[PDB]
């Protein structure tokens with residue numbers, strides 16, 4: 001048993017809810033929250049900008065030190081950093097950004113990072129401003145992640161479309 005509430009069960013291991021991931025993290029304090037990161041860990045917009053704002057910019061300060069030491073992530077890659085006030089840990093995962101021309105085949109590689117963690121609160125990778133089809137992102141998630149993933153979908157209209165169209 002875990003602390004996640006109000007989720008629809010899609011599969012043995014994948015759950016979904018219409019929720020603001022920031023508000024969900026603040027309530028649950030999960031072991032792992034996933035960030036929709038870019039390779040520079042520049043948390044300006046989207047889930048990343050919202051998560052970073054909720055940490056009062058401490059996520060960005062920590063991220064800048066990580067990049068100064070290690071250089072940029074790979075598209076499809078990840079790093080584990082602090083979860084600050086939102087979670088124990090934040091798994092920063094880089095899905096391909098279609099609005100920058102990145103290979104959508106890298107979305108499966110991105111989701112494979114989730115398998116290193118038994119339970120995660122996450123957004124749909126490459127959904128929203130990263131420009132991918134969220135229906136596709138949910139299909140790759142279900143077909144790739146084997147650990148327990150709680151997906152928080154911000155847009156109510158999209159949530160309903162994802163559930164209604166789910167095979």
Ligand SMILES: Nc1ccc(C(=O)O)c(O)c1
Pocket residue numbers: 020021022045046047050123128129154
């Ligand atoms: N508070 C939130 C939650 C999600 C997003 C998102 O873009 O997916 C956002 O931009 C703000």
